[PDB]
Design a protein around this ligand. Sequence first.
Ligand SMILES: [Zn+2]
Lengths: 148, 148, 50, 146, 148, 348, 107, 49, 66, 50
Amino acid sequence: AGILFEDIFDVKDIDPEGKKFDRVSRLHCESESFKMDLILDVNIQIYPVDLGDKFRLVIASTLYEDGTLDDGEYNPTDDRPSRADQFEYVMYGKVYRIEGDETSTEAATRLSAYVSYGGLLMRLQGDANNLHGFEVDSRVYLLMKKLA
Amino acid sequence: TRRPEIGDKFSSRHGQKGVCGLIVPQEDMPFCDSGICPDIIMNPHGFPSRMTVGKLIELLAGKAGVLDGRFHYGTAFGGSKVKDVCEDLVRHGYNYLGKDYVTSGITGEPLEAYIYFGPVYYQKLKHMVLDKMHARARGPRAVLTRQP
Amino acid sequence: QGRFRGNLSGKRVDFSGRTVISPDPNLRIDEVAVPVHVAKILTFPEKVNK
Amino acid sequence: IAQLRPGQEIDLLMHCVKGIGKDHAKFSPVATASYRLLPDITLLEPVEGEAAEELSRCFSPGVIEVQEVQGKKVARVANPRLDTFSREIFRNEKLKKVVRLARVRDHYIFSVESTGVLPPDVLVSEAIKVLMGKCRRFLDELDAVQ
Amino acid sequence: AASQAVEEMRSRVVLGEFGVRNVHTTDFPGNYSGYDDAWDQDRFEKNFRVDVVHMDENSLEFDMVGIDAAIANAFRRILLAEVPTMAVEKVLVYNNTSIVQDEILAHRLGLIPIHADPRLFEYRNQGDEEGTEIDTLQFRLQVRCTRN
Amino acid sequence: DIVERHLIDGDVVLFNRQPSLHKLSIMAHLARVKPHRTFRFNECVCTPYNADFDGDEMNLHLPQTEEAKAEALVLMGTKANLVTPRNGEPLIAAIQDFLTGAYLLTLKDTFFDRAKACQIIASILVGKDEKIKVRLPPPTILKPVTLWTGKQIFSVILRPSDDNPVRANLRTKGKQYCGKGEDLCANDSYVTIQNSELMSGSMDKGTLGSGSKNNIFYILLRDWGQNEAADAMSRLARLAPVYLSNRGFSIGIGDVTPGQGLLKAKYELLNAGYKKCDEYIEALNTGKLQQQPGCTAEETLEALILKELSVIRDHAGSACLRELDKSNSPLTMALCGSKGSFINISQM
Amino acid sequence: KTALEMVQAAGTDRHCVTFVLHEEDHTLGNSLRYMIMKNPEVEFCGYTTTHPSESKINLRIQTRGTLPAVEPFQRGLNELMNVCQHVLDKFEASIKDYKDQKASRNE
Amino acid sequence: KQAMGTIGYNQRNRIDTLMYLLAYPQKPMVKTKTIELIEFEKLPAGQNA
Amino acid sequence: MIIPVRCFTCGKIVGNKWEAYLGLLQAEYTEGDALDALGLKRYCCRRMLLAHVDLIEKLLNYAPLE
Amino acid sequence: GKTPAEFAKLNECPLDPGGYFIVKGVEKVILIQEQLSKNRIIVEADRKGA
RNA sequence: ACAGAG
Ligand SMILES: [Zn+2]
């Protein structure tokens, strides 16, 4: 595998401060299996997300499950079996800031990871044991499938 | 007989003076559905700082006027109102605020924003670059001080 | 208009020109377009060497 | 051309030559040549009643027809080609949400008005050959280099 | 649905209240998930049709279906700028005594359209002030005004 | 022998507006000969000269000596004079239609497919950039559609080829920052440029313009050298017109027309404010007025009236800006700071 | 005289080259770019006018694999020519069909 | 005051130090009442663009 | 001075409509009916006749003659 | 008191305002001069504040 | 000596 993180997320709010943009919506989500809160921008024109939807979000280091990190360039035209065939939405971006929780003065374990998908931001916040394998200046694939 | 070139000063009856900066062919102008392309393209950036709202109304009153054979009055503290000319434009099938669906002449694809289109009175000013270009290499000198 | 201000501290100079200015964004910021009519007049003395 | 008074005289001699319109605008053969994509105004919900009349006045005078089906007025799109898109359906507050003003992308409606030099069916045929001629010229230079 | 939104996005220019959307052309290979947008001459020759809807003296309206903006705009630009015609370039004036200035009269006579078929004539060479049978026509205007 | 040749491309030539208030009013430029009669220069250099292209005239001087070329080129060159001597702030930077085009490009709503990404980027491939391999970045969105977010296209200004060494870094507050987001703000107004890639935030006057520091061209100047700043400015001057002229950007009478939500609010404010003034009129002429300390009773009345009348403008002003939509062209120019202000919008 | 000049990118063995189409403007540029972008072996394609005073366009092509960019460019010219050949045959058929119908009516 | 236009009806029989004329002048499409009092729309200075 | 031969914006020949336009205004058409009867659909052509001043009809009095 | 048909014999324009002289062939206007009213008691402050 | 222009 080349998976960093994987969990099922439930959408809890769609626009906290109003609809600032047409195509983009700021999804605030919470995970069942782990206590992870998720901020995520998605293009809601190509992929529409509703306030009750439940989706599976995998973050992966490589899009080919055989664990070959060979990415000189990404060719859209090329067709081979990959991980994206199982998922509806895919984004490519870079982890750019790992930051500690400020809200407790002692004995804390929550971490924030920030990923930017060309300006579509993600904050993934949770226990340090679940965010393992994130490093600054690393490039990750988000993958996302809605569940019935 | 002089034809307008780069550097010739034109003005527009509201203090929006401006020198000619580029002359582009008819094939490169943006064009409406009816085939009209502008004689002059004016930059929108002049209006916010200068608040020449009267130019914006003159364009609208004139457009509603040419379409029905009227001269609309622009008299101080009076004149033809926006509410009257808006109803003239929609009767002739144009948008009530003069904005039109404009196609790019370079790419052929349509422009995203609607573009304001109308007839604005433009007056040519006496200041022409041909009467102002000057160069000296060496030449005649004064008699008292032997300097140019 | 006396000697010290008008003719000594500042003075009329040759190899000089003046024209209306107009924009051109396709030039670099270190460049200026000079018209051919000024360029044919404003000469520079190039010393001949190898 | 001119206008005279007695004793005044004009005598001259003209030389007509061939040129393209990129050189000077007196050579262009068209009054205007343009195109527009074709409208397909579609009704998302059925508009009945006296809202059918005010939907037929937010458009050009021949596109929305109001028809009686049971002694009741229902509106349908009839000829969306004649629409000029004045966007009057957005001044109305109740009917912004029942229409989808659009344009078919791959369907153009050319309008070529000639000035009289040669008729416009020959103008389009000549215009297509010019683009064929531009492609032919650079194929010759790829052959000349290689 | 995501698929219904994709189909609108690649086939309809939609007009909003504040701006047009889906303006660009997108049917290129690798822009979409399952679609095969590579060039296929047989698919072009099948879909393309031309319908002439109106024609009379000096006017023509016709529909092209299945061609792209990048080629329809080429036809628009050739008709404006690159289809040749015959027009006056030189005026040889003998005894002009009218109030109309000679430079203005020559400009007016230039803009008169001449019925000569331009395919039968060649381009006049560089220089060559006289010209010949192959590449020039000649007109003579001569008017004397007198009292009745 | 001495040959008095014509002025040719690459001559060092002095260029000067007639009133000079500082040293940057006269700078040295490399000449290029062009057919039309005017002098022409890139509009990023309008701010040092205080030039405005409304029939303005400028002077040109041709130094007649090799020693005068070198002093002009090394000391007075524009690339050596990007910052004013006074406070050390950049003056050669982006201006109107290079700030507005950059702002609209870097907004979160912009997505480009491969054909339009290439056609915006290919504009920069002119001049000395004609030999570089263009480095189209990987797309952001992959599975439903292949989209490039407009921030990536902007980053091609800062690093246009794989061999270019520039690694710019910037982290600053934008103009319309809410103050609590810390890169998660709702306005998308916090700027991060990490390794010459724009990770968040739109580009305002405060990041691409001449006002002050925290400017990415100032970062390039201080961290990578003069030539890198001058290249990026030439790329922005070339790229942003190609976007903006094919997006369309226009102002109309419908962009300054008061909606019904304001006309009710304005009527309430005028009636309330005038009636509060009328009571203080009565309290001066025919009663007690609480005379403020240090002023006479008449003067105390002027400061109360000016208080009421300021409240009317500010409350009516903050009512119009809440009912304006986005893509209102004065509001875009006010937000990015390219021209105008929220006073001007509220005033018209 | 020559209307075409090829300018290879400095590091790249013929897969990146800029084509200076002389005596041209947006008319050929945008149409030819469209046919080249329809080829799945092209990575980047786009044109710029060097200056409004200059009738040049710098058409850049970059290809994915090992193939030289001359081959997409030549295929681009040929397919555009075949499109314009087919557009003409359809147009002239519809004009003749319209004239024949109009002459067959009211007679 | 500086706009090119038409001095008057005697402008062709008039010899002056310097005179500017516009070839095809047009009268304003939007006009004041003051324009009608001074008769500016008889010898106008400008063109509708 | 005299009616321009072509419309500035599109190049339709409006220079032959002038002697007709004045004639129709003697038959008491309105301006907006007179331009519609001559074929001036687009408003850029309409302003050629609507905004024109016939100066040459008045300069030609002062002009010298036998 | 002439009619517009008789201005044409004099080569003059009916709309020409007059109000000016012709002296040695140049048209010269006496401008309106603004003045203070004589025979009026000004009451004003001196430089020294008296 | 006056009027302009920035
Ligand atoms: Zn016209």
